[PDB]
Amino acid sequence: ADVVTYENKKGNVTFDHKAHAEKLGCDACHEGTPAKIAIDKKSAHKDACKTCHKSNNGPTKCGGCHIK
Numbered sequence: 001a002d003v004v005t006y007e008n009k010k011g012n013v014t015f016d017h018k019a020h021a022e023k024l025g026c027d028a029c030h031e032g033t034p035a036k037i038a039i040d041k042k043s044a045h046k047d048a049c050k051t052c053h054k055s056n057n058g059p060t061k062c063g064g065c066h067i068k
């Protein structure tokens with residue numbers, strides 16, 4: 001997807017794939033041949049999601065990605 005969504009009990013998160021990529025350039029979420037990253041509450045909450053935001057706008061204040 002260019003955009004993706006993950007609905008979760010702690011609130012739904014939008015994923016951008018293209019929309020992130022326009023700033024990121026793939027090899028920032030990915031490295032060396034991109035493929036299906038193991039999204040879970042081990043990866044996501046490590047550098048996967050909870051790193052590359054504190055030096056950006058939008059999500060940071062815990063209640064960021066997760067809406068409702």
Ligand code: HEC
Nearest residue numbers: 008009010011013039040041044049050059062063064065
């Ligand atoms: C503030 C520090 C946050 C709290 C509290 C929680 N999150 Fe997250 N989160 C993100 C993703 C992509 C996932 C993976 C979905 C999965 O588990 O497969 C999660 C997951 C969780 C979960 C487990 C699911 C549930 O709803 O119970 C919990 C308990 C949870 N998160 C609490 C992404 C992000 C994210 C984007 C950068 C941020 C800022 C946070 N999560 C922050 C919090």
Ligand code: HEC
Nearest residue numbers: 001016017020021024025026027029030034035036037039
């Ligand atoms: C972090 C915000 C990402 C950016 C930026 C890019 N990708 Fe990505 N990609 C990401 C995740 C978390 C996943 C797995 C999604 C899931 O929950 O399964 C992926 C997956 C891919 C895949 C396989 C699935 C697909 O959509 O084809 C490929 C081939 C892929 N990603 C390529 C790719 C490229 C070329 C990017 C730059 C334009 C790019 N990704 C950015 C997370 C993120």
Ligand code: HEC
Nearest residue numbers: 013014015023024028029048049052053056057058059065
């Ligand atoms: C850098 C390598 C990033 C990674 C890895 C992830 N995200 Fe991200 N995210 C990043 C930036 C630069 C921004 C701000 C965009 C801007 O225009 O400046 C974001 C934004 C988000 C948002 C908010 C989207 C919105 O509603 O405006 C969400 C919901 C978000 N990011 C989620 C998210 C998740 C789930 C990630 C782990 C798979 C993830 N991001 C990785 C930079 C980077």
